[PDB]
Amino acid sequence: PMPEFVETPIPDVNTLALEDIDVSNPFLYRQGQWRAYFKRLRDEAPVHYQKNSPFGPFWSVTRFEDILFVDKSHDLFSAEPQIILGDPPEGLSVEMFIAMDPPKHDVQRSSVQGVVAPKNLKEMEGLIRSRTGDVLDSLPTDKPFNWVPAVSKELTGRMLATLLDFPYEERHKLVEWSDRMAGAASATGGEFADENAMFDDAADMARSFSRLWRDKEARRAAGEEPGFDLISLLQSNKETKDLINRPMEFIGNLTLLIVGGNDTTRNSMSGGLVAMNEFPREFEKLKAKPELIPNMVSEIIRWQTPVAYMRRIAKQDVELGGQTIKKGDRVVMWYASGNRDERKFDNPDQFIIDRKDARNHMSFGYGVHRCMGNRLAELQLRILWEEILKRFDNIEVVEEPERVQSNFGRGYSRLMVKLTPN
């Protein structure tokens, strides 16, 4: 079985030989060493091969331009069979089109992408803004509180329930299933190492999603107006009316949607407060010019970079960065490094809400796999900060945030926040 990752002090990157830099360490982000580790890789070995890691050997691509090329070159780099650095526990690999190459990727993505179509997102705006306001007003203003479960996880869990028309009181299952899936120690160095519970969740997921398919189909056959959820959309198109006869296209598509939006949205909502705390002149600039929120949302997403990387496999030998990536080698596109590449962003470690090229960030990736839910993610963040400006004159992080163990997700498990209303 995959042993748990136990945290040990990560030394300064300059004490290491270039060949010994291992950025798969799932504690790099928590210990605040990722910036120095990736900067040295960008400057001295932008295409870096690590032959010794707990996940096996892999290439690290750390420069913005080189990540662009790898992400856009689905002719040279495959997203199959997995896009995380390591491997899922054997038997637990789920086929998701995020880890599929064209043309099969295009067919499956096209059958689900309507759930985040612009018209369908506008139909969700009122509920998103209603829930955001209902969560923010319920927050205490006389004492600090943990922002992660109070706001980030709360709003995220509701959004995921809306996307699937999942039972509202069972929405916590979607978060729990997604957390254990994305936090598998064998895949991302996360803290979930019990493979038995992963098989249990996969069984509960199949049963619960199947029962949801039946219930929606029965409700549809009874004349219930079709909603804006993925299930309603899938049962309204001829090509996916029988998707239940394809359990893997069914479970994989539904599993990808909830894992895709779970801790990404959660950590984007928390990360904006961390950036505001580290650069408070941007909060004054925001209150003076609230029209900057759309661009600030992009800058929040760039600065946080909730998904640290996507992994590829070289379909062939590929020359890149002066190195020869061999066919079959694993290649890791470090978005978290690309978004801090000063070759692309001036003062890249600085949170600048009116940054002219904030929209050019690679937190959503690029190419055929570029985040399908990116507009929904930006919509939730825009509404959250619109509703924050309506209510609060200042937001203070009163404690050192606690960061999640993972090399894949960059997020916070604890964010103590003190609110000051206006």
Ligand X SMILES: CCCCCCCCCCCC(=O)O
208: contact with ligand HEM by CB under 6 A: no
CA 161, CA 175: separation in Å to the nearest integer? 10
Beta-bridged to residue 184, according to DSSP, are 192
Range list of H helices, 279-396? 281-288, 293-304, 335-338, 374-391
Binding span for ligand HEM by CB under 6 A among 18-26, 284-292, 370-378, 384-392: 370-378
> Do the annotations mark residue 366 as ligand-binding?
yes
161: contact with ligand HEM by CB under 6 A: no
**Interaction mask 57-76, ligand HEM, x per CB under 6 A:** --------------x-----
> Do the annotations mark residue 412 as ligand-binding?
no
Q: Which of residues 358-387 bind ligand X (CB under 6 A)?
A: none
**CB atoms inside a 10 Å sphere around CB 317:** 12
Task: Supply the minimum distance, in Å, between the C-beta of residue 221 and ligand HEM.
Answer: 27
Among 86, 88, 183, 261, binds ligand HEM (CB under 6 A): 261
Which structure tokens are listed for 89? 């526990």
Neighbour-count burial of 102, counting CB atoms closer than 10 A to its CB (0-12 exposed, 13-18 middle, 19+ buried): middle
Binding span for ligand X by CB under 6 A among 3-11, 92-100, 135-143, 386-394: 92-100
Beta-bridged to residue 361, according to DSSP, are none
Task: Supply the minimum distance, in Å, between the C-beta of residue 175 and ligand X.
Answer: 14
Residue nearest to ligand HEM (CB): 373
Which structure tokens are listed for 328? 């079959």
> Do the annotations mark residue 369 as ligand-binding?
yes
> Do the annotations mark residue 359 as ligand-binding?
no
CA 41, CA 340: separation in Å to the nearest integer? 12
CA 200, CA 354: separation in Å to the nearest integer? 46
CB nearer to ligand HEM: pick between 41 and 331: 331
Beta-bridged to residue 330, according to DSSP, are 313
Beta-bridged to residue 47, according to DSSP, are 61
> Do the annotations mark residue 48 as ligand-binding?
no
Q: Which residues contact 99 (CB under 8 A, 6 or more apart)?
A: 79, 80, 81, 82, 83
Q: Which residues would be at the binding site for ligand X (CB under 6 A)?
A: 84, 88, 92-94, 180-182, 184, 187, 198, 259
Residues that bind ligand HEM (CB under 6 A): 71, 97-98, 105, 109, 163, 256-257, 260-261, 264-265, 268, 301, 306-307, 310, 335, 363-367, 369-373, 376-377
What residue numbers does the annotated binding site cover? 105, 109, 312, 335, 366, 369, 371
